[PDB]
Ligand binder design. Structure first.
Ligand SMILES: OC1(c2ccc(Cl)cc2)CCN(CCCC2(c3ccc(F)cc3)SCCS2)CC1
Ligand SMILES: [Cl-]
Lengths: 99, 99
């Protein structure tokens, strides 16, 4: 679909049998989702920001359905203040920026 | 242009006479650029991140060329690691998300 950017680009994602709201973010390398447990083993990952680090868990071949489009990739789960779809899942649904 | 997201969407912008490389970021509401000496009156601003805040200089009707498209808007200037051009200027150049 065409998403203009006057409002935050929030969409629905179905992941782990849950329907959640997430931000399509071209400035994120990785996808970061609010806490939940998924199927599989997880690798600890410590992600950074401005005055520190946050520990998150990395799950690896998770099916996600972003606005009906199925995509498979790595998801990081942890205490994020908003669900963020990073470029790793945006490339999978063939999303481009256009102007 | 139609830009794909396999690599970081970095573009050449022109602001305050100097050329810069910046990240097209749909997740960020604002445009935050590195220290440059912009001519103009400014206000201090705080932008929060992981466990803290950083102070920047808010400038308000700045002309910014982004891949030849001129846009006018607010730019926050300060110790950013990464030059962010967010939604406030992406709407101005007619940038969309499409899939
Ligand atoms: O924009 C920032 C900023 C930039 C400049 C200035 Cl001056 C101030 C603030 C402040 C916000 N962070 C967000 C980190 C993005 C990632 C992440 C998402 C959620 C989460 F809980 C943890 C990490 S997304 C994947 C890895 S980090 C970047 C720099
Ligand atoms: Cl941060």
């Amino acid at each position: 679909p065409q998403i203009t950017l006057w409002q935050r680009p929030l969409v629905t994602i179905r992941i782990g049998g849950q329907l959640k709201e997430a931000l399509l973010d071209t400035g994120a390398d990785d996808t970061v989702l609010e806490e939940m447990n998924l199927p599989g083993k997880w690798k600890p990952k410590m992600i950074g920001g401005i005055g520190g680090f946050i520990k998150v868990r990395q799950y690896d071949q998770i099916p996600v359905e972003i606005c009906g489009h199925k995509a498979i990739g790595t998801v990081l789960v942890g205490p994020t203040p908003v669900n963020i779809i990073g470029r790793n899942l945006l490339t999978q649904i063939g999303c481009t920026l256009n102007f």
